[PDB]
Amino acid sequence: NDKVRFIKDELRLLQEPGSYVGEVIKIVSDKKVLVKVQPEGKYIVDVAKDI
């Protein structure tokens, strides 16, 4: 039963459009963060509710 599940988890996990590596320029206290993304532009983005 576990084995069936393991293979399945890989099949889901490997389907992704990829996430961009970026650098926090500075922290904002409205729970936004400023990130200068390596290949993209610069964006101010909404930090995770749980982060």
């Binding site: 039963n1 399945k8 509710k49």
Partner: protein, 849 residues
């Protein structure tokens, strides 16, 4: 040392020398059997000779050696056939063991030989020499004066004459001990035999012995007529009470007969009571006017609904679709059931504006559960919402006719004729969506109302609502045909519906007609096997979903291995996910009486890769294990509460609450963490619609009717099977599949009540019976036996389980005759000193009766 001197004389010539050889061998056969085994053909040739007269001795010697080989069956023939070499009257290792085998042989055979012919024991079919050894075993047993052994061997071996003779002979009419033996066979004969044909014969013949009367148990006298539905047993039952008329005896029986019996029998019995000459007393008991008054009484005095909690729930968010409104409407109705309390609706009429069409239909109808119990003001409340008087909304208007049917079900008699006309009326035309929802409510309501009683006029009407093919109305109609024709159906309904399911196309219709077809098959078993085959043979998902239930219902009560096996096969191998869920749910109902087996079955199946399986199993375990404990069971549902998928979380929460109603509140330490968790979800708004849906209705079940009334199946307050209950949960399993199906949970809320009782006619005494008891009216949700005084012992919350430790004292005007009944849903101590000191506080039933 050697058997060789002896064996030498066995082959020597002259008959005399061979007679001596047999007797020489005889003495030491056992020790030397190995050597003597080779000489068996020679010994066997003496046996076959019918000129040589020590044939019997040669046989005896053969038997001993075959036994030592492993051929027990062969030696058993050979000892009989010798015609004196079977003697049980000596005590030996040889004798004991081959007797053990002989009974086994007759019993195995006896299964087969009964099925061909039910007179076999009466006859030469199983040969006299075998039948004698078996008959002697019976005598052996009886001498030891422990009856359970004698009756056991004969039950397995299909001999009716022996079951009768055993009960008859030993009667001292101690007297109690014979009666106990009678009651043990009765429970047994239904729960262990699956054959109809045997079981009826025992049940009518044992009725006669109890019917003679010096010590007889009324509950048991009542049970056996209910199950078999025979008019003749009822005629005699009633004829006895005329002769031996006491208010005490006459109430006890009628009070049993109003719970356990079904409507169509109930009617057929009354018809006979009138034609025999009647007592006006019984006819009032059978009304069920008393039971509904008791319930009201209980709820009024014992309240603790906790509307601060419901208020707490609603107000946390209004998000998460119109589903969120459907839940808190449903939790309102459960909390306030029969207490009469409208709190949600009074506050939020904006809330109604939020709510969708289908949520507005649940909200009207939730009032149907609230005013259930009053059969006078139940209609009355619904009056401003009827047609000929209109409504605020057409969506309300539909829910009105569904709420009325809730209230009056099984006594809908008048209202049914009324509701039938709206139905026949809007089949001619009414494709407007407002009129469809009207036609919908009438169809739902009337199937609840005529449930349990054949009306071909009901079947006929509804079939034409189906021929319009409304996705809305067809669902209603379809259930309504199943609900009415409950029983054994007809050959007609089966073929006509089944063909018609392939012919017409809709999804809602397919789901409705499948459940429709299952319902007519109750208590059928092998006669239902034909429609089971056809449905599983359809490759439609809808029909296979319905197919499980058909087995569930047909075999409802009686545990059958074949039936459960058929559900396990469909459940594993089909691709369609929906069918797996329906089918695990279906296991529980067969297995209701073997509830110890359910924690082992669903230990595997809560660990599955398909979520449908997990949801269905929370419900499966819950249904089967509802009427009793099962702590191990509660341990399974634990993971499922927090299971990653939202609909598995939902279902575990709901499931958990149906078992532990007043076993909650720190009886089990964990149950506080579960109750807390129910709160946490609602308060959270990062929890999804189905998860919070699940927390909200589970809150309503626990806290149902002010924490006093309970979720049963395989009841402990009435003690017998209920049609309302099995059917009720089956509607319950669907609630997102079609939204206003919840309300059938109404049909199986049972009072836990502990009240004074009178054998005589009611006036409401209320007094404590002070026997030692645990804490479980002190452990309920929040805002042993030793024979000592106890803090509260009348009314309160209590527990069905705890009520049995508090037993009616002989130290007032109230007299035991049962050492407490064992049930606690209708009370009853027998009052032998009417209109005397021992309390007096009239109820509301004594203000009009």
């Amino acid at each position: 040392t050697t058997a060789a001197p002896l064996l030498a004389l066995l082959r020597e010539n002259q008959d005399s020398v061979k007679t001596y050889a047999l007797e020489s061998i005889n003495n030491v056969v056992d020790q030397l059997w190995s050597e003597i085994s080779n000489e068996l053909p020679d010994i066997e040739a003496l046996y076959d000779d019918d000129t040589f007269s020590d044939r019997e001795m040669a046989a005896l010697i053969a038997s001993k050696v075959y036994y030592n080989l492993g051929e027990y069956e062969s030696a058993v023939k050979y000892a009989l056939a010798a015609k004196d070499r079977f003697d049980i009257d000596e005590k030996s290792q040889f004798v004991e063991t081959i007797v053990s085998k002989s009974i086994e042989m007759y019993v195995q055979e006896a299964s087969k030989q009964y099925t061909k012919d039910e007179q076999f024991y009466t006859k030469d079919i199983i040969d006299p020499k075998l039948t004698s050894i078996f008959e002697r075993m019976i005598e052996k047993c009886l001498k030891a004066s422990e009856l359970k052994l004698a009756l056991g061997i004969a039950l397995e071996g299909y001999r009716l004459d022996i079951i009768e003779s055993a009960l008859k002979s030993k009667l001292d009419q101690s007297t109690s001990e014979n009666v106990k033996i009678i009651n043990y066979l009765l429970t047994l004969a239904i729960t262990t035999v699956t054959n109809s044909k045997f079981r009826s014969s025992i049940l009518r013949k044992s009725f006669d012995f109890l019917m003679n009367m010096p010590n007889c148990d009324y509950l048991t006298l009542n049970k056996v007529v209910v199950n078999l539905n025979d008019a003749g047993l009822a005629l005699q039952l009633f004829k006895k009470l005329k002769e031996e008329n006491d208010e005490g005896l006459s109430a006890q029986i009628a009070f049993d007969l109003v719970s356990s019996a079904s409507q169509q029998l109930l009617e057929i019995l009354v018809t006979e009571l009138t034609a025999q000459g009647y007592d006006p007393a019984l006819l009032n008991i059978l009304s069920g006017l008393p039971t509904c008054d008791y319930y009201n009484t209980f709820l009024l005095n014992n309240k603790n609904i906790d509307i601060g909690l419901l208020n707490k729930s609603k107000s946390s968010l209004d998000g998460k679709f119109s589903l969120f409104h459907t839940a808190v409407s449903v939790a309102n109705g459960f909390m306030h059931a029969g207490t009469t309390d409208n709190s949600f609706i009074k506050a939020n009429l904006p809330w109604l504006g939020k709510a969708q069409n289908w949520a507005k239909f649940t909200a009207t109808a939730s009032l149907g559960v609230i005013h259930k119990g009053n059969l006078l003001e139940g209609k009355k409340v619904m009056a401003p919402y009827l047609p000929g008087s209109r409504a605020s909304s057409r969506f309300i208007k539909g829910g009105s006719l569904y709420g009325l049917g809730l209230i009056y079900a099984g006594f809908g008699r008048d209202t049914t004729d009324y509701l039938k006309n709206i139905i026949v009326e809007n089949s001619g035309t009414s494709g407007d969506e407002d009129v469809d929802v009207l036609l919908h409510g009438a169809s739902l309501g009337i199937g609840l109302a005529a449930m349990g009683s054949a009306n071909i006029e009901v079947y006929e009407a509804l079939k034409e609502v189906l021929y319009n093919d409304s996705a809305t109305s067809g669902e209603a109609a379809a259930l309504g045909m199943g609900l009415c024709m409950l029983g054994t159906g007809k050959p007609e309904a089966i073929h006509d519906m089944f063909t018609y399911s392939q012919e017409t196309q809709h999804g809602n219709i397919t789901r409705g007609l499948a459940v429709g077809l299952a319902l007519i098959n109750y208590g059928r078993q092998e006669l239902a096997d034909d429609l089971i085959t056809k449905m599983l043979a359809s490759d439609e998902s809808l029909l296979r979903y319905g197919g499980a239930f058909t087995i569930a219902l047909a075999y409802a009560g009686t545990g059958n291995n074949s039936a459960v096996k058929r559900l396990l096969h469909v459940a594993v191998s089909d691709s369609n996910d929906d069918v797996r869920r329906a089918a695990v749910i279906a296991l529980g109902f067969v297995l209701l009486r073997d509830y110890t087996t359910v924690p082992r079955i669903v230990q595997l199946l809560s660990k599955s890769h398909n979520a449908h399986v997990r949801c269905g199993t929370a419900f499966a375990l819950g249904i089967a294990c509802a009427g009793k404990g099962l702590q191990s069971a509660i341990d399974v549902l634990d993971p499922l509460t927090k299971d990653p998928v939202d609909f598995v979380r939902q279902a575990a929460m709901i499931a958990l609450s149906m078992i532990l109603i007043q076993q909650t509140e720190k009886l089990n330490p964990q149950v506080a963490d579960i109750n807390k968790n129910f709160l946490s979800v609602i308060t959270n708004k990062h929890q999804e619609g189905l998860a919070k849906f699940g927390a909200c209705v589970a809150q309503g079940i626990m806290n149902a009717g002010g924490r006093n009334v309970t979720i049963q199946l395989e009841n402990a307050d009435t003690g017998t099977l209920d049609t309302k209950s099995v059917v009720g949960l089956v509607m319950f399993s669907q609630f997102w599949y079609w939204f206003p199906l919840a309300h059938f949970l109404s049909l199986s809320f049972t009072p836990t009540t502990v009240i004074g009782i009178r054998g005589s006619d009611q006036a409401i005494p209320k007094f404590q019976m002070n026997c030692y008891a645990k804490e479980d009216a002190f452990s309920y949700p929040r805002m042993k036996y030793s024979s000592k005084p106890y803090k509260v012992d009348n009314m309160t919350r209590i527990l069905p389980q705890q009520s049995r430790y508090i037993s009616f004292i002989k130290d007032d005007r109230f007299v035991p005759v049962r050492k407490f009944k064992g049930n606690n849903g209708v009370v009853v101590l027998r009052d032998r000193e009417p209109k005397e000191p021992v309390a007096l506080i009239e109820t509301v039933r004594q203000m009009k009766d």
